[PDB]
């Protein structure tokens, strides 16, 4: 009857593949800015570059504790509200649907549910009954691990993070209290980590006919009621992943290039030994977190809190059905995956710190010695151009005897450090002999160049203490 018209009507729905779900964020064009600022202990080089991030994915992350709309097999509009992950459901009258669940220990036939009139309470009711039986049958006498998924990203802008984690991330992100300002100023580095623990997945298998999803009751072709066209078409929820998920902000004041490594070591089981750079970074890291799966909670504190956050809910048991943490949609017409294409431009701030240092000289040789020590001071002008300003030790070329000592302060902007040391041999037609000569000397924390011995046999030590 009218459903035979629905089959071919939906099959006649002509809509643009991959394009109707495409959205793009804010835009900006390539502009070079590179500055160098002398902080009292470090020279800091900040480099900003236009970057783009694009994602194309099937999974939609759930941020709402109470679903109301995100039950499996729900039909949602393909609309502005869908892209922004705040969908609008069209509810009138639904036909029965079969579902499947991937729990281990379930005999094949028992993995299938048959729901009469699909709704939130309906489907969740079925699933919860099934689970109640499964926890006693299998769950409490077996050790079943949840499936674990990590995603992570360095934070630069809220739009970037929206593209990464979903268009409805902003509320959660606001709860994480992300200091984008300090990332832009080069004073902080921030990583966002999404951790998902999947207990089970309720999925809908292939739909033979597009009409099978419907009874025959009311407004069958008249379903053009409110905006259901080849321009504003329908989707159904192909699957919903249930479990627990955590959004984790790791925010450090370190300017080090070992931040990501330390964060990675932290997320894993690795315990970090003291007096390490990792240990210092993690000491200076603030942790914020949003836990889901009676609602979403905001916890805060130090790095040690991460372990627990990750271990909790690792084994699926009763006392919690888990909440929908993800869902995946497929178009009515065919097996078509509904992939969401998002992209945005963002400003990437890169920071490089150059530790200040000291060059110490000790002369205890039985000879006249001369030093020739030169370097460049690095600056960036207002056009971001590299400028090198030549500098020299003020006692260059002067005759020095034992026991001479000095300390030469070298800020982090020092480049092209050259040290040459020679001694007067007292020999006719070989008046000078080079004791030491190096160029491009690394600006370590503490370098001590000592010379001793005699005119004939001068000796030298180049001692590096970079701690």
Author numbering: 1 to 293, 298 to 471
Task: Recite the paper's sentences.
The cholesterol-dependent cytolysin (CDC), pneumolysin is a virulence factor of the human pathogen Streptococcus pneumoniae (pneumococcus)2, the leading cause of bacterial pneumonia and a major agent of meningitis and septicaemia as well as debilitating diseases such as otitis media, septic arthritis, keratitis and sinusitis. Pneumolysin and other CDCs bind to mammalian membranes through a tryptophan-rich loop and a threonine-leucine pair within a membrane-binding domain at the base of the toxin. Once bound to the membrane, monomers then oligomerise to form a pre-pore complex that subsequently undergoes a complex set of structural transitions to form a transmembrane pore, typically comprising 30–50 subunits.
In this work, we have determined the structure of pneumolysin at 1.98 Å resolution. The best crystals were obtained from protein containing substitutions Asp385Asn and Cys432Ala. The asymmetric unit contained a single molecule having the characteristic four domain structure of a CDC, with three non-contiguous domains (domains 1–3) linked to the C-terminal membrane-binding domain via the strap-like domain 2. The tryptophan-rich loop, projects from the base of domain 4 in the structure of full-length pneumolysin, reflecting the likely membrane-binding conformation. In the structure of full-length pneumolysin, domain 4 is offset by ~30° relative to the plane of the long axis of domains 1–3, such that the toxin resembles a bend rod from the side. The interface between pneumolysin molecules is created by the concave face of one monomer packing against the convex face of its neighbour. Intermolecular contacts are made by all four domains, but mostly involve domains 1 and 4.
